[PDB]
């Protein structure tokens, strides 16, 4: 009946339409701060000198952008990894030129998304569930840490973190390939394997359950009405599904146990995306994809090109053009 | 910007017409029960 105790009960109440919790206590403010700032920046921020060369890049809608080209532009390379809150700027006008809003958005976001994961554990504990859904979400969350925090740390600048924008995303992934040969990196190959494999298993599982719905409706109604929320019986015949997919391949490459099957669906895309997030995290310290440039030569010693050398030519065209004004010396070492 | 002027009528119709369709069928679904 005491005040702190009543507040604590509201915080952890399983009766709120949306659950708060102690992790929610941090996430809500930080996600509103990031969200409100993002929305205003995207619409109305003036251009930002991302590359520190007094060459500002316009990213907002009122400054000539559309939905596809707009972005909140990364903070200036003159700042590097230095902290740049609003209160370190002579004025909001300076803060905006130097890319201040990016730092605000990504820090509040990563915080609240970290608490978002915590909140997945917390409410699971309050409902008497098993706890590990948050482990699954850690694969995407790790990916966001990689492109917004980790890659900027090892390269030395928040100016090489991913723009918050559709074309800026593409700028980021082009430059990454020229500098790290990410395609030739095994961890990116596993992320593809995870992400193609995930989409395939999503379709396979969805088509196979959908193929074995037990008849419960007529031709004039959505079969979906054959399931009622909270029914005790299962709504498809898995033996029949096993019987079909077993024969489409062979009996033993198909699941007859639903628990192994659903854990399989969980594990495959999660693991693969751990790796592709680790790939971005480790190419931040410039341990790059395989390099077979000129690995093949003839008896005289001529280069005999492979497809790797062709890749390298494309990579070069990226190298020499990106941030065309920002390099005064022959090597781009970060 | 020097943008396509039918862009606006195009977007509005792209949005309005499928939407009104969905609404019309929804509201008459509710009027049954």
């Amino acid at each position: 009946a005491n005040l702190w105790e009543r507040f604590c009960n509201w915080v952890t109440s399983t009766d709120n339409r949306l659950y708060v919790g102690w992790f929610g206590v941090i996430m809500i403010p930080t996600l509103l701060a990031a969200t409100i700032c993002f929305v205003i920046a995207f619409i109305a921020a003036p251009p930002v000198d991302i590359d520190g060369i007094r060459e500002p890049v316009s990213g907002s809608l009122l400054y000539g952008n559309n939905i596809i080209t707009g972005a909140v532009v990364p903070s200036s390379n003159a700042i590097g990894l230095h902290f740049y809150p609003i209160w370190e700027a002579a004025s909001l006008d300076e803060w905006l030129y130097n890319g201040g809003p990016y730092q605000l958005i990504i820090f509040h976001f990563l915080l609240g998304a970290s608490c978002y994961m915590g909140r997945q554990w917390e409410l699971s504990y309050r409902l008497g569930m098993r706890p590990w859904i948050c482990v699954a979400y850690s694969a995407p969350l790790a990916s966001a840490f990689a492109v917004f925090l980790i890659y900027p740390i090892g390269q030395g600048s928040f100016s090489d973190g991913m723009p918050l924008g559709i074309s800026g995303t593409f700028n980021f992934m082009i430059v990454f390939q020229a500098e790290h040969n990410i395609l030739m990196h095994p961890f990116h190959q596993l992320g593809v394997a995870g992400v193609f494999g995930g989409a395939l298993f999503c379709a396979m599982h969805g088509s196979l359950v959908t193929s074995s719905l037990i008849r419960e409706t007529t031709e004039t109604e959505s079969a979906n009405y054959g399931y009622k929320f909270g029914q005790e019986e299962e709504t498809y015949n898995i033996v029949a599904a096993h019987g079909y997919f077993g024969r489409l391949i062979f009996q033993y490459a198909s699941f007859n146990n639903s628990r192994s099957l659903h854990f399989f669906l969980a594990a495959w895309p999660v693991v693969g995306v751990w790796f592709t997030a680790l790939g971005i995290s480790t190419m931040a310290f410039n341990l790059n994809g395989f390099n077979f440039n000129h690995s093949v030569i003839d008896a005289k010693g001529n280069v005999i090109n492979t497809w790797a050398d062709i890749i390298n030519r494309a990579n070069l065209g990226m190298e020499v053009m990106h941030e065309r004004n920002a390099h005064n010396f022959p090597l781009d070492l970060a | 910007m020097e943008v396509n002027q039918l862009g606006l009528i195009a977007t509005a119709l792209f949005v309005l017409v499928p939407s009104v369709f969905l609404i019309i069928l929804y509201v008459q679904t509710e009027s049954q029960q």
Binding site: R17, I43, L61, K228, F229, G230, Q231 | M1, L8
Partner: peptide, 30 residues
């Protein structure tokens, strides 16, 4: 007018979010 069109659609999605959550058809058991 391009700016206006983009913001209006985005705004509408946020309002649809609102109704989809607080004004969903409520799921009911057995």
């Amino acid at each position: 007018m391009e700016t206006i069109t983009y913001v209006f659609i985005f705004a509408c999605i946020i309002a649809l979010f609102f109704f989809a959550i607080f004004f969903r058809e409520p799921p009911r058991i057995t």
